[PDB]
Write a protein that binds this ligand. Structure first.
Ligand code: CHL
Ligand code: CHL
Ligand code: CHL
Ligand code: CHL
Ligand code: CHL
Ligand code: CHL
Ligand code: CLA
Ligand SMILES: CC(=C/C=C/C(C)=C/C=C/C=C(C)/C=C/C=C(\C)C=C=C1C(C)(C)C[C@H](O)C[C@@]1(C)O)/C=C/[C@@]12O[C@]1(C)C[C@@H](O)CC2(C)C
Ligand SMILES: CC1=C[C@H](O)CC(C)(C)[C@H]1/C=C/C(C)=C/C=C/C(C)=C/C=C/C=C(C)/C=C/C=C(\CO)C(=O)CC1=C(C)C[C@@H](O)CC1(C)C
Ligand SMILES: CC1=C[C@H](O)CC(C)(C)[C@H]1/C=C/C(C)=C/C=C/C(C)=C/C=C/C=C(C)/C=C/C=C(\CO)C(=O)CC1=C(C)C[C@@H](O)CC1(C)C
Ligand SMILES: CC1=C[C@H](O)CC(C)(C)[C@H]1/C=C/C(C)=C/C=C/C(C)=C/C=C/C=C(C)/C=C/C=C(\CO)C(=O)CC1=C(C)C[C@@H](O)CC1(C)C
Lengths: 201, 201, 201
C-alpha cells in the first residue's frame, strides 16, 4: 500500500481521521500519524526525535539478534557458554576463567572488566564522534543515511527502492524495539531467557 | 471569583506576578498560570497537553469512586467481596470461584482472565476510536466536549454555565488525580487501603 | 579559552562540528552546544530549562557540601552525631533524643518531625514566592541574577568579570549535580557514605 503522502497507512486504521496531527504529512519514513502527546510539534525537535528513533531502532535490532543467538546456540547446537542468558552474560567477567567466545579458551579469553570498559569507551567515543561529524570512512552527509562506505552493495541507488527500504528499516526497527522491551519486562518478571520462555510456551 | 482572563486566580496566590508564562492568558479552563517547565509553550503541544490532562482527570475521578466504593461497602454495608481492596481486587480472577460482582455467584461470575482481557481490548479499542473520530453516538466535533449524546440533560446549553462547569470539571479532576497519586503512594508504602488508612487515622 | 560566541568550547571536542544545534549560539553561560534531544528548540522552553538548570545546580552545590561536612567531621574531627551519614541523617528525628546539632543537646535539640515540616513549608514557600516575584530583599530584576542584596560584596560589578563568574558558577554547579547523582547511585548500590567510600578506595 501507500506509506508516503496524504493517502498513507495510519496508526488507528479506519478510526485515524482525527488522530493525525497537522505537522505529520507523510514526508518521512514511518509516518503513521501517531503523535498524541505533541512531542514533535517543533520541526527541529521532530528531526532530533527521528534521529533518536532510528538510532534506538538499529541498536535494538542488533540487540535482539545478539540476545537470541547465544542462548539458541547453547540450547540446540550444543555450544557451551559460561552464561548464555542475555541478562546474565555480563557476569561471566567476574567468574573464574573469564569470558571465552563460543566457550573456547583459545578465543578472546578476556579476564579484566576494566580493560573491556576502557577499550569500549575509547572505541565507541571515537565511532560516535565520527558518526556525528567527519570520520575516515566519509563525512556526515546525512545524520542517518551516509550511504557511501556504509552502503557498499548499492541497495540505495534507486530513490524509489531507497524510500521502500527506509520504510522497511523503520518498521523492522520498531518491531525490534518492541521485542527488546518485551525481553526486558520478561526478564524482570519471570527471570527466564526469551528462548526458554518460548520453549515453555 | 474570576477564573478567566487577566484577573483570574493564580497558582502562587499573591506571589504569582512573575510566575505566569506569557502564553498562558486565561483562555482555557483551569488556567492558573502554572507552567514552569515550559512544556506547553508550543500551542499544539499545549492543546495536546490539555486533552491529555482532561482525559487523565476523568479517568482519575472514575478511579477514585471505583476504588472507594467496594471497600466502603465491605466495611460498613456488610457486603462480602473476595478482595475488596483496590490494589488486590485484580487477583480475584486467579482465586477459585472467580470474580463475583457484589460477591454473588448469580452475577458476572468470571473465571477466565484471557476472555476479560480480550473483551476489554476490543471494546475499549472501539470506544477510543469513536472518541478520536466519528462513532455511532455522534462525530467528534470537539476532542473533549462532544455534548450531543454525552450531554443529554442539557447542562451545557448556557455558555456562561458551560464555562463555570468546565472550571468545576477541571478542578474536581485535578483533585481526583492528586487523590489517586496519594492512593498509589499509600498502597506502595503502607500496604493498606484508603478506607482502612482513613479509619486508623 | 573562549566560552561565548561562535568560537567557544563544545561538548564533543574536535568532533562537535555536526553536534551543535542552530539555536545554541553561545549567548548564555554553559553553552557547549549539547542539546541532542531537541528539548530547548523553543526559546521560551530554553529559558525555562536554563532557570531549572541553575536552580538545580545551586541546590546541588549546597547538597554536596552539606552531605560531605558532617560525615567528615565525625570521621576526623571527632564530633559525635546521631547519624552522620547523609542518607541516614533524616531518621534521627525518630530516634530518642532527637536531632542535636553537632551532637550537643544545648543546640537545636529538635524532637518533632511535624513542627520541622510545617516550619519548612511556611519558610520555603515564602522564600520561593519572594524569589519568583518581589520580596523584602528587592524585587525580581532577574530570574537568576538579582544581585543587589544577593551580591553584597560586588563581585558582579564588572560585566566581563560577571560573564566569567557566570561560566564558573554553571560549571561548578554541573559538576556538583554530577557528584550528587554519583552520591545517589553509590548510596543505592553499596549503602555506604561518600567519605567512607573514598576512604575504602
Ligand atoms: C531489516 C533491517 C534493515 C533494513 C531494511 C535497512 C535498510 C537500509 N539501511 Mg539500515 N537497514 C536495516 C538494519 C540496519 N541498518 C543499520 C545501519 C545502517 C547504516 C549505517 C546505513 C544503513 C543504510 C540502509 C539502506 C540501504 C539498504 C540496506 O541496507 O538494506 C538492508 C538489507 C537487509 C536488511 C538484508 C538483510 C541483512 C541481514 C541478514 C544482515 C544480518 C547481520 C548480522 C545480524 C550481524 C550484523 C552486525 C553489525 C555490527 C554489522 C536502507 C534504507 C545505508 C543508507 O541509508 O545509505 C543511503 C547506511 O548508510 N543502515 C543497522 C545498524 C548496524 C541495522 C541493524 O540494526
Ligand atoms: C465533578 C465532576 C464533573 C463535572 C463538573 C463535569 C462537567 C462537565 N462535563 Mg464532564 N464533568 C465531570 C466528570 C466527568 N465528565 C466525564 C465525561 C464527560 C463527557 C463525555 C462530556 C462531559 C461534559 C460535561 C459538561 C456538561 C455538564 C455536566 O456534565 O455536569 C456534571 C454534573 C455533575 C458532576 C453532577 C454530579 C454527577 C455525579 C453524582 C455522577 C456519579 C456517577 C457515578 C460515579 C458512576 C459513573 C459511571 C460512568 C462510567 C458513567 C461539563 C463541562 C459534556 C460536554 O462538555 O458537553 C459539551 C460531554 O460531552 N463530561 C467523565 C468521565 C465519565 C467524568 C467523570 O470522571
Ligand atoms: C562556585 C560556586 C559559585 C559561583 C562561582 C557563583 C557565582 C556567581 N553567583 Mg552564585 N555562584 C556559586 C554558587 C552559588 N550561587 C548561589 C546563589 C546566588 C545568588 C542568589 C546570586 C548569585 C550571584 C552570583 C554572582 C556573583 C559572584 C559570586 O557570587 O562569586 C562566587 C564566589 C565564590 C564561589 C567564592 C567561594 C565562596 C564559598 C567558599 C562559600 C561557601 C559557603 C558555604 C558552603 C555555606 C553556604 C550556605 C548558603 C545557604 C549561603 C556570580 C555569577 C549573584 C548575581 O548573579 O548577581 C548579579 C546573585 O544574586 N549566586 C548559590 C545558592 C546558595 C550557590 C551555591 O550553591
Ligand atoms: C572508524 C570507523 C568507524 C567505525 C568502526 C564505526 C562503527 C559503527 N558505526 Mg559508525 N563507524 C565508523 C565511522 C563512521 N560511522 C559513521 C556513521 C554512522 C551511522 C549513521 C551509523 C553508524 C553505525 C555504526 C555501528 C554499526 C556499523 C554499521 O552500521 O554497519 C552497517 C553497515 C555496513 C556493514 C556497511 C559497511 C560499513 C563498515 C565498514 C563499518 C565498520 C565495520 C563495523 C564496525 C563492523 C562491526 C564490528 C558501529 C558501532 C550505526 C549504529 O550506530 O547502529 C546502531 C549507524 O546507524 N555509523 C560515519 C559518518 C559517515 C563515520 C565516518 O567515518
Ligand atoms: C459505542 C459507543 C460509545 C461507548 C460505549 C463509549 C464509552 C465511553 N466513552 Mg466514548 N463511547 C462511545 C462513543 C463515543 N465516545 C465519544 C467521545 C468520548 C469522550 C470525549 C469521552 C468519552 C468517554 C467514554 C467513557 C465514559 C462514558 C462517559 O463519558 O459517560 C459520561 C456521559 C454520559 C453518561 C452521558 C451519556 C453517554 C452514554 C450514551 C455513553 C455510553 C454508555 C457508557 C459507556 C456507560 C458506562 C458503562 C466510556 C469508556 C469519556 C472517557 O474516556 O472518560 C475517561 C470521555 O471523556 N467518549 C465519541 C465521539 C463524539 C463517540 C462517538 O460515537
Ligand atoms: C525573606 C527573605 C529571603 C530569604 C530568607 C531567602 C532565602 C533563600 N533564597 Mg531567596 N530568599 C529571600 C528573598 C529573596 N530571594 C530572592 C531570589 C533568590 C534567588 C535568585 C535565589 C535565592 C536563593 C535562596 C536560598 C539561598 C540563599 C542564597 O542565595 O545565598 C547566597 C547569597 C548571599 C549569601 C548574599 C546575601 C543574601 C542573604 C541576605 C539571603 C538571606 C540569608 C540566607 C537565607 C542565609 C542562609 C541560611 C535561600 C533558601 C538561591 C537558591 O534557591 O539556591 C538554591 C537562589 O538561587 N533567592 C528574591 C528576589 C530578588 C528575594 C526577595 O526578597
Ligand atoms: C474506572 C472504572 C472502574 C473500573 C476499571 C473498575 C474495576 C473493577 N470494579 Mg469497580 N466500580 C466502579 C468503577 C470501576 N470499577 C465504580 C464507579 C463503582 C461505584 C458505582 C464501582 C463499583 C464496584 C463494585 C460494587 C464492584 C466492583 C468491582 C470491580 C471489578 C470488576 C467486576 C465486574 O464484573 O465489572 C464489570 C461490571 C459490569 C459489567 C456491570 C474490578 C476490580 C467488583 C469487585 O470484585 O470489586 C472488588 C465489585 O463487586 N466495582
Ligand atoms: C557494538 C559493536 C561495536 C563495535 C564497535 C567497533 C568495532 C568499533 C570500532 C571502532 C574503531 C575505531 C574508532 C578505529 C579507528 C581507526 C583510526 C582512527 C585509524 C587511523 C588513522 C591513523 C591512526 C593512522 C592516524 C591518521 O592521522 C588517520 C587515520 C584514519 O589514517 C560491536 C559489537 C559486536 O562485537 C560484539 C560486541 C560481539 C560480536 O559477537 C557481535 C558484534 C556486533 C560484531
Ligand atoms: C510514538 C509516540 C507517540 C506519542 O505522541 C508519544 C509516545 C507514546 C511517547 C511515543 C511512543 C514511544 C515509544 C513507543 C517508545 C518506546 C521505545 C522503546 C521500547 C525503545 C527500546 C529500545 C531498545 C534498545 C535500544 C535495546 C538495545 C539493546 C541492546 C543494544 O544493542 C543489547 O541488547 C545489547 C546486549 C546484547 C546484544 C547481549 C546481552 O547479553 C548484553 C547487552 C549489552 C544487553
Ligand atoms: C502542571 C505542571 C506544570 C509544570 O510546568 C510542569 C509539571 C510540574 C510537570 C506539571 C504538573 C504535572 C502534574 C502535577 C502531574 C500529575 C499527574 C497525576 C498525579 C496524574 C494521575 C492520574 C491518575 C489516574 C488517571 C488514575 C486512574 C485510576 C483508575 C482508572 O479509572 C482506576 O483506579 C481503575 C481501577 C479501579 C477503579 C478499581 C481497582 O481495583 C482497579 C483499577 C483498574 C486500578
Ligand atoms: C544537557 C542535555 C542534553 C540533551 O539534549 C538531553 C539531556 C541528555 C537529557 C540533557 C542532560 C541532562 C542531564 C545530564 C541531567 C542531569 C541532572 C542531574 C544529575 C541533576 C541533579 C540534581 C541534584 C540535586 C538538585 C541535589 C540536591 C541535593 C540536596 C539539596 O540541597 C541535598 O543533598 C540536601 C540534603 C543534605 C545536604 C543533607 C542530607 O542529610 C539530607 C538532604 C536533604 C538530602
Amino acid at each position: 500500500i501507500e506509506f508516503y503522502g496524504p493517502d498513507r497507512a495510519l496508526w488507528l486504521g479506519p478510526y485515524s481521521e482525527g488522530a493525525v496531527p497537522s505537522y505529520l504529512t507523510g514526508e518521512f519514513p514511518g509516518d503513521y500519524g501517531w503523535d498524541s502527546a505533541g512531542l514533535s510539534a517543533d520541526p527541529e525537535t521532530f528531526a532530533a526525535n527521528r534521529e533518536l528513533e532510528l538510532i534506538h531502532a538499529r541498536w535494538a535490532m542488533l540487540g535482539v539478534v545478539g540476545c537470541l543467538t547465544p542462548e539458541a546456540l547453547e540450547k540446540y547446537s550444543g555450544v557451551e557458554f559460561g552464561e548464555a542468558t542475555w541478562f546474565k552474560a555480563g557476569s561471566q567477567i567476574f567468574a573464574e576463567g573469564g569470558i571465552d567466545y563460543l566457550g573456547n579458551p583459545s578465543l578472546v579469553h578476556a579476564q579484566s572488566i576494566l580493560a573491556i570498559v576502557w577499550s569500549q569507551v575509547v572505541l565507541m567515543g571515537l565511532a560516535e564522534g565520527y558518526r556525528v561529524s567527519g570520520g575516515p570512512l566519509g563525512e556526515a552527509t546525512d545524520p542517518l543515511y551516509p550511504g557511501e562506505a556504509f552502503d557498499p552493495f548499492g541497495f540505495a541507488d534507486d530513490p524509489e527502492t531507497f524510500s521502500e527500504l527506509k520504510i522497511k528499516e523503520i518498521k523492522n526497527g520498531r518491531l525490534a524495539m518492541f521485542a527488546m522491551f518485551g525481553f526486558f519486562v520478561q526478564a524482570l518478571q519471570t527471570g527466564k531467557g526469551p528462548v526458554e520462555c518460548w520453549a515453555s510456551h
